[model samples]
Each structure stands twice: as C-alpha cells, then as structure tokens.
Target: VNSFSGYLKLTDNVYIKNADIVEEAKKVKPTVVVNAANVYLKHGGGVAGALNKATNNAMQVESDDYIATNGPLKVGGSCVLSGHNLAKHCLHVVGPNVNKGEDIQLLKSAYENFNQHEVLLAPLLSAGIFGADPIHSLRVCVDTVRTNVYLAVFDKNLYDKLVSSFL
Candidate 1:
C-alpha cells in the first residue's frame, strides 16, 4: 500500500505510489468542484444539454461522499475559470474570445501559469466579434484546446454548473 505523512486532499479515493501527486482518486470519484453555475456551455452538444449532463454526473458521483463537482457556478464576466478540490486534481477550460491574436496567446500564457488543480480559467475567447455566436465559437475554441490538451474532465453536472453561471 502507499503512504502519506500529512493531511491528504483527494477528490476520489484511489491510491498510487508514483509520488508524482499526493493521491489518485478511485473510480467515479469527484475532484472537480464549482462555485456557481453559468448559463452557457460548449461541450457534449449545446449549453442546456451540457448543463443537464454535468449536473447528473455530479449527483451520481456525490454518492461516493466526494465533492469533486459543483453546480450554481459563479462564472463571472467572460474571463474566468473553475476546478476540483477533492479529486486527484482538476482542469478548467475557458472559451471566451479575444482580438488581434489575443485569445490563444493568453490561453498559452494561462496554461503556463495555471496550477492544474485549479480550473484553467480565461476570458471569453469568442464573446464579442470573435465568432458568429457562442456555440460556433465554442466549437472552434474547444477544437483548438483539444489538439493541445488531453486532460480528464469532471462529471457532466459540475461541468454544466460552472458553465451555466457564465451565460
């Protein structure tokens, strides 16, 4: 078995001994938590669908006694982020827009300064003139993110809550 010296914070209950991190969450454990939910999203289809899925996922994961995801997302403005608290760690994705090559540029910088455990936050990369609308812009923004990222997202409910708070 693995060992720890101090208080360990985990979203899940899985244990690993690589020592890279304090611990690994077990199956179906929640590590992602949100402050308040936003009204807009860009994953698993439209915002409403994404919100419902995220909320449902959180409900199921809650049975594990882990608070990995949160609803009532407190997404403020167009440039903000979210994260997990108990799970091994959390990753946040921001899709706000920018101008004059600012979006991805800021995103790259955000990635550099990100804590990984906290949500990867940023401004709306497509809020204004960035794209035709939130959904289409989201498709483009998310696609770009996927190409450079391969992180595991939290439950759908948590995703929804955090996202919904924004729009």
Candidate 2:
C-alpha cells in the first residue's frame, strides 16, 4: 500500500503575511535577481510577458525601482497576494486562481500525481494572481513531467537543523 510519510494540507487563505515575508528576509537573505527578457522597465508595473508567464513579473519587481509592494501581497500585487513568495527563505511559487476555474484542475492533477508516487516540489500554497482559497489550491500543481524544481524552499540541511533545534 502507498503510504505518505508527510502530509501538508493548506488551510483556507494560507499565505504568509507580508510582515512574515519581510521577517524571513531579516533572518535569511533578501536579494532580487532578474532574469533577462525584461520588457516592463520602461512601462512601469504592467507587462513582462513570457511562457513561464509570471517569471516575467518575478524578473521585473526584482529589477526595477518599483520595488516590493508595500502591503501583504508584497512582491506581487494584491491581486496575487496569495501567490508565490520565493523572495522569502523557503521555496514558494504559488499563484492565483478565481471563479472556481484553475483550482478544479489543480485538485485533479494533485490526486493523479500523488497516486503515481510523484515527489512534487510544489509552490507556496496561497501564492497566486487570484484569491487564495482551497479552490485556488485545486488549480495549484507540480506534475510528473516536471523534474527538479524550486521556489523559496527549506534546504535539506536547514530542515534537519530546525528540527533538531526544536526537539
């Protein structure tokens, strides 16, 4: 029988608050590195389109003077307040979904992948362009086609250290 060694379930609206995100950096390191293919430097906080679509936004907010947002959503806008927070120490690449659209697809894929014993490196649960709800979670995904991936994640060593410190 398939057995889960660890289980992580997202509660409703499960994003780390902006203060927490900032706090993480103070404890860790905060540097925004922008990958090339930037088109928003001139237009302000609007467009940075690409296949890894949001990567464009990720590149921009880190590169330009616009800086991180002043509120809870922080790096992305409030629209995506629920999405990824890779800027923090742990790997997090959650994104937004609303209208019950993306979440449905995500829930199905999640079940399918786990049934297959896939070690999915998932994004931060509530990070997205839309609202962060379990419905939003339903659209969240990390599938078999994906190999190694990351967001702001706990390092293997750090994981052990944190646990040791606690116990």
Candidate 3:
C-alpha cells in the first residue's frame, strides 16, 4: 500500500513528497486539490480516478457539468469545481499528452494555471499515462507554482528520482 514516506522543500513555498495523493490531500486539507485531468475532464484513470473515487464520484458529476457548461478544457487550461469530500475546491487542469506531441511548455502552462490559494495539494501533472517524464514534470511544478504547495507523489521509484534530482 502507498504511504507517506518523506518530503523535501523545493522552495520556501513548495514541497514534494512520496505519498498517496488523495490521503495526503484529505489530511492536509489544502484550500485546493488539483486533478491532473485530460482535456475532456474525464475522471477515468490515474490520479483523476483516485480523486473521483475518494469523492464518491461526485467530482465526476461536477466535471461532466463543467465540461457541458464550458466545453472541453483545452490543454494547459484549468477549471474549478466543488471538491466534494476532498477539499474546499478542486482545480482540474489538462496537461499535455506527450503521445500527442504535446511538449514541456504545455505542461508548464498547466501548472502555471493553478488557482492561487493559501494551500494547494497537487500530483505530478502529465507524468503518468500522459507520458511526460516525472523528473521534468517535477521541475515544471517546482518552477511554476507560487503558492504554498504540497506535491504528492505515488510512485516510489519516481519519488526517489525526484529526491535525488532535486536534493
């Protein structure tokens, strides 16, 4: 089972840790929990799936409503929704799919689009099935985020890579 391992301060306002993202988000109770979403905002798999399950699928309902009302979220774009059982709010942002020729700039844009909040919890965007390298994703997240951020990483190997790369 995934558990909280350790963390490192990337900046005064940003931290990275190895932990189950959903559980950490609940425990920390950040003002906003970010969902590394697809352009359609489908909570089908990966971090999106985990967050949706934690919220009893209420997040999926909200996502559908948001897409219906605002159309699909473009790559690097973001939209906010009720966090349901998670946080006060959830920020869903679409990152670039490397398989689709999307690049680091788009990934940076996704992180840059995060809503300003006192405390923010987020996973490594585009570092999963979307195919961006986790180390690069961490760099973009560290470089782009401005508010207090708690970055939850689920994979042990990737967490080690990030730790070694950053620390």
Candidate 4:
C-alpha cells in the first residue's frame, strides 16, 4: 500500500501533490468538487464514475438532467450536481482525450467556466484516464482556479512523483 502525500505551496496558497482523493475529500468538505466527465455527462469511468458512486448515484441523475436540456457539450463545458454528501455541488467538466498541448487549454477553459465557486476540490483533471500528465494538468489548474484549490491525488505513482518533487 502507498502512503498519501503531496506538496503545499505557501507562496500563492496553491497545493500540488498526490494522495487518496476520497480520504482527502472527507477532510476537504468542499463547497464544490469537480470531476472529469464526457461531453454527455456520462460518468462511464475514471473520477467521474467514482464520484457518481460517492454521491450515492445522485450525481448521475443530475448530470443526465443537464444533458437533456443542454444537448451534447464540447470539451470545456460543465454540469452541476448538487445535494451531494461530500460537497454542496459536484461540477462535472468534460475531460479531453487528446494531446497535452490541446487538452491543457481545454482544461483551463473548463476551470474558467466555474471559477466562482468557493472551497474547490479537484483531482488531476484528465491526467489519469485521459492520459494527460499531472504536472502539466495541475499547472493549468493552479493558474485557473479563482480561489485556492485542494488538489486530490488518487494514483500512487502520481503521489510519489509529486511528493518527491516537493520533498
């Protein structure tokens, strides 16, 4: 088993590291938790699906409702899932399955779309299931979020790498 670890930036109050998303999530108790999803808001796999289960399937129900009204979304679009146990809102953004150079901008735009929320908790968006590197992905996140971010780390290798870089 791997230990949960990561780095906290004291300078800008930004955190970039690795750890268990669920455990960290309990501590965060954020107003918003953003998950990576597809354009249709389907939590097929990855953090999106995990969040669906976490919220007792409430997320999917709301996400589906959003899709029905909004039609299919693009990469930077988002949906809101409220009444969750862990968070007041679950902001589902469409994670891109493309190259880093392309996905980076898309990720930033998605973050931009919902920067108004407070106490945000997010994983390395699109870094795991979508194949984007956490370093690049997290950097984009740091620059985008309006308030401070509580970055959740779910993968062991990612945690190790992020921790190593800090300590």
Candidate 5:
C-alpha cells in the first residue's frame, strides 16, 4: 500500500516526506494540491497525470475550460481548479524549463504562488521533466511556503538526499 513515512520538519509548517503525492494527498485532504503543470496544463504524464487519474479526469475538463478563457499559463504562473475527489482545490503552476535556460527565480515564483493556500500537498516542482535539480527545488519550496505544506516525494534516492540535506 502507498503510504507516507515520518516527515523531516523544515519549519513549524513545512515538511518533507517519503511518500507518493497522490496517495498522501488523498488521505490528508489538504486545502490544495500543487501540480507541476505545463503551460498548456495537459495532464499527460508524471505528477499531473497521476492527479488527473485520481480526480477522474475532471481536472482536465476544468483545465480546458480555464485555458479557453484565460489562455495558456506562463512559466511561474498558476491557476486554481476544483480538486474533485481529492483536495478542496488544485493549484497548477508552470515551472521553468531548465533546458530553456530558465533559472531558479522562475521556479521560486512558482513556489511563491502556492502561499495563498492554507494547507498544501505538493511534489518537488520542476524536479522531474522540467530538469530541475531535486535539492534546489526542495530548497525553494522550503523557503517560500509559509502555511502548512507537505513536500511529498516518491523516489527513495531523492528522499534520502532531501533528508541528508536537512541534517
């Protein structure tokens, strides 16, 4: 069964956990879940895909409608959508593409956008397909989120790195 291990508390409100983002979010039912989304908000693969599946694809339709009205999200930009069976809402933020020479500032901006929510469940944004170094992504998340935040992670190697960094 997918589950969360004990967390490493970064602050009173911020934490890092060895867990699947979707599974943990489903259990905890935070106020919002963060998706490291594409500009187009296509829930094709990775964390976005998992969230799409968990929400029964309702998020996709919501995203389509959002794009139809608001245009594609820019890097570091975010939009809130109903989380359906998951959390109260989903916050989709487009992180910077490292290959495009986008720096950590854009990623920081994405992390900063998440502060509006009270309790959040998020993965390490841009640490996957966007090619961000995992440690850097986690650091940005650690520094920016002021409310209750759980930084869920799936990869054991990455989880180890994160734990060691805090030591």
Candidate 6:
C-alpha cells in the first residue's frame, strides 16, 4: 500500500524517502534494514517496533544472542540479523533514548561504522522514540553512508517540506 510519494536524491548512494520504511524495504529489498534500537534491545515501539513486527521480532532473538556473546551492543554500535524480513540482513543500531543531545553524534557514529554496504533501509534514527527532529537525524544518516542508502520514514510531514524542496 505504500509508495514512494517523494524523495531527496543527495547522491547515487543516499536517498531520503517520504514513504513507509517497511514498504521501501519490500521495494528496494535491501541487503540490510537498520533498526533504531535500544541498548537492551527493548525496541518494541515506533520505527523499531514496526520493523521488529515486520521481521517477526527477529532482532530480539538476535539481540539476545548478541548480548550473550558481545556483552552489550552499546550506543554507536550495531548487530546484523537475518531472515523473515524484507531484507536479507538487518542491522540493529543502539540509538539514543532521549530526544536530544550529543547522542546525535553517537547515532551518526553507528551509520559511519557501516560504510561498506549494499542497499540499506533505515529510519530517522531516534527521531520517533526520542522525539528528535527527523530532518536533523536524516541529515546525519545520509551524510554517513558511502553506498546506496534508503532512508525511510513513517510520518512524511515531519520532514517532507524540507526534504521535498531538495527533490
């Protein structure tokens, strides 16, 4: 039901979509779909919740497994998951729980760490759960990726005006 209503083509590698992130996931069928995750992997709300549900909560199982092995998937870190989602792989990034502050840099750090990538489907990190502005977060996401990026968002109005102008 979701379609690409509008987009910002920052480059061949970076794209901002005013469409549903999950729908974009099916459309592009990326190699990885990134989750704006929590430190405890308690990502059952907003973008994380939607994707978690869409992927049958695969991240939870993966997150648990990750913790058992890696200690803690800290902020500015990620975990790759597989199966049952639109993408072949999934990346869960530990994002800020609060709406504001230097965690923006931490969020940016998560993106930078995934430089060598294929098609990636992601959200405005921490924007929904933390009430951070989508525009600022989207900028941080797009600025970090080196390969094809599909930045999908649920609420178009949050950044549509500023994003559409760039289209």
RMSD values, in order shown: 14.1, 13.6, 3.5, 4.6, 3.1, 3.6
lDDT of 1 at 98: 44
lDDT of 6 by residue, 49-151 (tens): 7777886777667767867877777777777767355778878777665654545567678777567566667776767767566666666766777867667
lDDT of 5 by residue, 58-114 (tens): 889999998999889989989888878888888998888786687668888888888
Q: Model 4 over residues 1-167: C-alpha lDDT tens digits?
A: 11223556523645655565655665566677778777888787788778788777887888788779879778887767773776777777775666433455677887675576655677777777787777777666767776766677877787667656542
Highest lDDT scorer? 5
Candidate 6, pairs of clashing residues: none
Worst 10 residues of 3 by lDDT: 1-10
How should the candidates be ordered by lDDT, best one leading? 5, 3, 6, 4, 1, 2
lDDT at residue 111 of model 1 (Cα atoms) = 31
Query: Over 4 Å off in model 3, which ranges?
Result: 1-6
TM-score of each: 0.26, 0.26, 0.91, 0.81, 0.91, 0.81
Model 3 alpha-carbon miss at residue 3, Å: 17
* Candidate models: Cα lDDT each: 0.29, 0.28, 0.83, 0.69, 0.83, 0.70
Compared with the true structure, the alpha-carbon lDDT of candidate 6 equals: 0.70
After the best TM-score superposition of candidate 6, give how far the Cα of residue 85 lies from its true spot, in angstroms.
Answer: 2.9
For candidate 2, the per-residue lDDT at 166 reads 28
Error of 3 at 26 (Å): 2.2
Weakest lDDT window of 10 consecutive positions for candidate 6 = 1-10
Prediction 1 TM-score vs. true: 0.26
Cα displacement (angstroms), candidate 6, residue 118, comes to: 3.1
Give the least accurate 10-residue stretch of model 5, judged by summed lDDT. Answer: 1-10
lDDT of 2 by residue, 62-100 (tens): 434332433232222112111224332112221224433
Score candidate 6 by TM-score against the native.
Answer: 0.81
